[PDB]
Paper text:
S. scabies produces a 200-residue, 22-kDa protein that is a single-domain enzyme called Scabin. Scabin has been cloned, expressed, and purified, and shown to harbor dual enzymatic activities (GH and ADP-ribosyltransferase). Scabin targets DNA as a substrate for ADP-ribose modification; it also shows enzyme specificity towards genomic DNA from Solanum tuberosum tubers. Scabin shares nearly 40% sequence identity with the Pierisin family of mARTs.
This includes the key Arg (Arg77), which is important for NAD+ binding to the active site; the Ser-Thr-Thr motif (Ser117-Thr118-Thr119), which comprises the scaffold of the NAD+ binding site; and the hallmark catalytic Gln-X-Glu motif (Gln158-X-Glu160). Other residues that were studied included two NAD+-only interacting residues, such as Ser117 found in the STT(S) NAD+ binding motif and Glu160 in the Q-X-E motif. The rest of the Scabin variants showed either a WT-like crystal structure or similar CD spectra to the WT in solution.
Author numbering: 36 to 200
Write the structure that this text describes.
Amino acid sequence: KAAAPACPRFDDPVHAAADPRVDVERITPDPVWRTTCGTLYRSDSRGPAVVFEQGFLPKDVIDGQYDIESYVLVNQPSPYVATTYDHDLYKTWYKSGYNYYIDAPGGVDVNKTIGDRHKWADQVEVAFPGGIRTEFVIGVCPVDKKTRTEKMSECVGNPHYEPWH
């Protein structure tokens, strides 16, 4: 066996952003940025033809909700795209057709930023300001809704994924 190396640290905390107009200075409270580089996940009903082409774009980088606690607690258009550390969080998401696999630098670690006592701490979220370019989306597995399992023979890799570590 072999021990794992550390992660490349990018200088720009929103290097991964699909929409660079995001204003890092407006993020509240003070963000604690993720410095690890393991696979993250996103439940999304949008199909891979769209996500692989566009990446994950945020709803509103201009007038969206930049306060993380507010965005977590009350769903409102925001500059953030939510992801999770938890491969299995898709099992709790009703109706979301796909479990996307993400290999992206950075993101705001929600529980490190607003604590792990809030209602949704169990989501172990990483919030990406400005979203996530397609080159950081590994791929996707569709989810069977009846059993809350991945349809592993129907997973698809993103042709635009660019490994970086």
